[PDB]
Design a protein around this ligand. Structure first.
Ligand SMILES: [Cu+2]
Ligand SMILES: [Cu+2]
Lengths: 318, 340
C-alpha cells in the first residue's frame, strides 16, 4: 500500500492527499537551474528514468524515502525464534569457491565488452559500430552449503543468501540494528533436502537476483546485471559477512496454478512466488536478545567470513 | 568458654572496624593487625573506643596463612556462591579457618582478616568453619538477618531506623514495621507469593542448607551422606510447596523454563540495598532474554550453548542409565545411588 502511495502509481488509494511525492521530487531535483522555464532548459539527469542513477543525489533522495518505508517496518513485531526456526534443519556451514583463488574469496576486476551502436547512429553511413565499454566484473564462484536434516522425511526449503560488510566505516564490527539494512540479496532458490547430511552446490551464474551477462551486452529476462552481482571490494581485501537461511517452503509457497521455483518475472508470473516479505529475514527489527548477526541466527541459518579482493587489471570479454 | 563467646563478637557490626566496641567487649588489636587506613593513626584511634568496654580481649600477633586469594574480592563487592571464582575464593578461606591449630589462633586470624575481607564472604566462611570445627560445636551463631538485614529488608527502612536511633532516646524508640508485599503491585499476579518468596524463614532455610552442604571446600565439610540426593529432594520439596501456594492464589503450577532462548516473562525488582556494596541490587525487566556471558573480573566466559550442551550430555547419561567418569569407566545410575 505504502509503496503505491509514495511512488504514486494509479494504484494509490488517494493521490489528492498523499501526492506524487517520489516522481515530483525527482522533477524538483532536476530543475534547480531553471525552475520557471525562463531559460527554456530541459531537466538534468535526475528527471529521466534512463539516467537518474548517474547522479549522486539519486541515492540521497532514495535514502530519504527509505526512512519513510522503515518507519512503517519498525512498527511491525520482530520475527520470533519460532518464526525463524525450521525444526529439523541445521545449516552447519557455507563456503564460496572461485577458480584460481583461496576458499571464501571473491575476486573482481575490469572487463571490456564491445557493443554495436550502428542501430543508434542516425544519419551515419551504414556498417557495424563497435563501442568498447569498461565495467566491473567478478570471477565465477559457487556456494557449497552443508545441511543436516533430522526429520526422517524429505524437507523442502527456500534458501536465502545475503551478504553484508563485516565492519562499519571506522572498521568496527557492525551491529544488527545497522547491518540488517546493509544486507544485499545474493540469491534465493528452492531445494529438496534428504534425511541426514546434504551437500548443496550453487553456481554464481544461477542467481535468481540477476539476469545473464548477455541481456546487458550482446530473448526474455530482467533483474540485476550479472557483472554487478559482487561488490568491488579492495586490492588488499575487504571483509564481508555471508549469510544463508533455509526457511520452510510449506509456509513460503504461494498457490499459483501456473508457476527455478524462486524465479520471478513480473511479465509472466501472476503472483510473486514467495510469501515472506521481500527482504526476509532482515526487513524487521531484531527480537529481544539479539545485538548482532551471531546472536540473531537460528540453526537453520549460518554465517561465513568472506574476503572480497579487487584486482585492478582490465581484461577482454571471453 | 570466653574464647568461644568472643568469636561471636566477630559477627557484631560487620563493617565497623574490629577495634570498635563489640557488645560489652573490645579487641586489643596489635599494631600490625590494623588496616592501612587506620594504622597510621592507630594508637589515637584504638583508645577512643577502648575506654568504653567492661571487658578487654587480647589478641596475639602470630604468623598467618596467605590471605591473598580470600582478599582478592573487593570489600564493596557482592558475594555469590554460584560464581565459580567466588566459590574457589570461599573454599580457600574455609580452608584457612578450618586449619588454625586451635581456637586462639582462629580468633587471631579472624581478627586480622575481618577488616580485610568482603563481609559477606567472611561471614559465610567463618560460619561454615564454626559449624564444622571440633572445638566450636555448640556456639549459637547469630542469624544472618540480624547481621545483614539488608538482604531481607525493603531499603526504605534503613533511613527510618537511622533517624529513630539518632533522634529518639533508647527507652522511647518504637519498632519499625517491615513492608510486606512491596516488590510489585496487583498488575503482577506473581506479587501474591510474597508470603513465600520473601519470607525471612524460607530464605534463611536456603542459606542454611548451603552452609551445611557446601559444594566446594575441604573434604571434611563437603562429603556428607547422600548430599546429592538431598540437593535433589530439598529443591523438589520447594517446588511442591511452592505449587501448593500457587493453588491457593488462583494460579497454575509453575511452568519450567522451556527454552533458554525465549524471553522470560516474569520480571522482578527486589527493592534491596546492599550497605556492604553501598549499591542497590539490579532487577530484571519483564520478558528479558538470557545473554552470552563475558565478565573478566568474575572469570566467567560462557555461551548459552555451553549450558545447552551440558543439559544434552546429562539427559544422554540419564537415558543411557550411566555416567562416564574422567578415567572413562561407567558409573551406573542404579536405584540406590543414581539420584545421588
Ligand atoms: Cu526515484
Ligand atoms: Cu539451593
Amino acid at each position: 500500500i505504502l509503496g503505491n502511495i509514495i511512488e504514486s502509481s494509479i494504484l494509490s488509494p488517494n493521490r489528492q492527499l498523499y501526492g506524487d511525492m517520489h516522481n515530483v521530487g525527482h522533477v524538483f531535483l532536476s530543475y534547480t537551474h531553471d525552475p520557471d522555464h525562463r531559460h527554456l532548459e530541459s531537466f538534468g539527469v535526475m528527471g529521466d528514468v534512463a539516467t537518474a542513477m548517474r547522479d549522486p543525489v539519486f541515492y540521497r533522495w532514495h535514502s530519504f524515502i527509505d526512512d519513510i518505508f522503515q518507519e512503517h517496518k519498525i512498527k511491525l513485531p520482530a520475527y520470533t525464534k519460532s518464526q525463524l526456526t525450521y525444526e529439523g534443519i541445521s545449516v552447519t556451514g557455507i563456503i564460496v569457491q572461485s577458480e584460481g583463488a583461496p576458499v571464501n574469496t571473491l575476486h573482481t576486476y575490469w572487463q571490456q565488452s564491445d557493443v554495436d551502436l550502428s542501430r543508434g547512429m542516425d544519419f551515419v553511413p551504414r556498417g557495424n559500430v563497435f563501442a568498447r565499454f569498461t565495467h566491473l566484473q567478478h570471477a565465477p564462484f559457487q556456494y557449497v552449503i552443508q545441511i543436516d536434516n533430522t526429520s526422517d522425511a524429505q524437507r523442502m526449503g527456500f534458501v536465502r543468501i545475503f551478504m553484508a560488510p563485516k565492519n562499519d566505516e571506522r572498521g568496527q564490527p557492525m551491529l544488527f540494528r545497522d547491518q540488517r539494512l546493509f544486507m544485499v540479496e545474493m540469491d534465493k532458490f528452492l531445494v529438496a533436502l534428504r534425511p541426514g547430511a546434504n551437500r548443496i552446490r550453487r553456481r554464481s551464474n544461477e542467481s535468481t537476483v540477476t539476469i545473464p551477462f548477455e541481456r546487458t551486452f550482446r530473448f526474455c529476462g530482467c533483474g540485476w546485471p550479472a557483472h554487478m552481482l559482487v561488490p568491488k571490494g579492495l586490492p588488499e581485501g575487504f571483509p564481508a559477512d555471508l549469510f544463508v537461511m533455509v526457511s520452510n517452503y510449506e509456509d513460503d509457497r504461494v498457490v499459483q496454478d501456473l508457476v527455478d521455483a524462486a524465479s520471478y518475472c513480473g511479465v509472466r508470473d501472476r503472483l510473486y512466488p514467495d510469501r515472506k516479505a521481500m527482504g526476509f529475514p532482515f526487513d524487521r527489527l531484531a527480537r529481544t536478545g539479539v545485538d548482532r548477526l551471531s546472536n540473531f541466527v537460528t540453526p537453520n541459518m549460518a554465517i561465513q567470513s568472506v574476503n572480497v579482493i579487487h584486482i585492478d587489471k582490465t581484461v577482454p570479454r571471453t | 568458654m570466653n574464647y568461644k563467646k568472643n568469636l561471636l563478637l566477630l559477627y557484631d557490626r560487620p563493617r565497623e572496624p574490629i577495634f570498635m566496641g563489640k557488645g560489652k567487649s573490645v579487641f586489643d588489636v596489635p599494631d600490625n593487625y590494623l588496616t592501612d587506613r587506620y594504622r597510621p593513626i592507630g594508637p589515637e584511634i584504638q583508645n577512643r573506643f577502648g575506654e568504653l568496654a567492661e571487658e578487654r580481649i587480647p589478641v596475639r600477633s602470630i604468623a598467618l596463612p596467605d590471605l591473598r586469594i580470600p582478599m582478592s574480592l573487593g570489600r564493596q563487592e557482592q558475594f555469590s556462591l554460584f560464581i565459580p571464582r567466588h566459590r574457589k575464593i570461599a573454599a580457600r578461606l574455609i580452608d584457612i579457618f578450618m586449619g588454625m591449630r586451635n581456637i586462639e589462633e582462629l580468633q587471631s586470624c579472624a581478627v586480622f582478616a575481618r577488616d580485610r575481607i568482603n563481609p559477606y564472604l567472611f561471614n559465610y566462611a567463618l560460619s561454615v568453619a564454626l559449624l564444622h570445627r571440633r572445638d566450636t560445636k555448640n556456639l549459637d551463631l547469630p542469624s544472618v538477618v540480624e547481621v545483614f538485614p539488608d538482604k531481607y529488608v525493603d531499603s526504605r527502612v534503613f533511613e527510618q531506623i537511622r533517624e529513630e536511633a539518632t533522634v529518639v532516646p533508647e527507652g522511647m524508640r518504637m519498632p519499625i514495621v517491615i513492608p510486606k508485599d512491596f516488590t510489585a503491585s496487583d498488575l503482577d499476579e506473581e506479587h501474591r507469593l510474597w508470603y513465600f518468596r520473601e519470607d525471612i524463614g524460607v530464605n534463611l532455610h536456603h542459606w542454611h542448607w548451603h552452609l551445611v552442604y557446601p559444594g566446594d571446600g575441604p573434604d571434611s565439610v563437603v562429603r556428607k551422606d547422600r548430599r546429592g540426593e538431598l540437593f535433589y529432594y530439598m529443591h523438589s520439596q520447594l517446588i511442591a510447596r511452592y505449587n501448593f501456594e500457587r493453588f491457593c492464589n488462583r494460579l497454575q503450577r509453575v511452568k519450567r523454563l522451556n527454552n533458554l532462548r525465549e524471553p522470560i516473562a516474569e520480571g522482578y525488582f527486589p527493592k534491596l540495598d546492599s550497605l556492604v556494596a553501598s549499591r542497590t541490587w539490579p532487577g530484571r525487566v519483564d520478558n528479558a532474554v538470557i545473554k552470552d556471558l563475558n565478565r573478566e573480573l568474575d572469570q566467567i566466559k560462557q555461551d548459552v550453548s555451553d549450558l545447552e550442551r551440558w543439559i544434552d550430555r546429562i539427559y544422554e547419561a540419564v537415558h543411557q542409565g550411566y555416567v562416564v567418569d574422567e578415567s572413562g569407566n561407567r558409573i551406573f545410575l542404579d536405584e540406590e545411588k543414581g539420584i545421588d
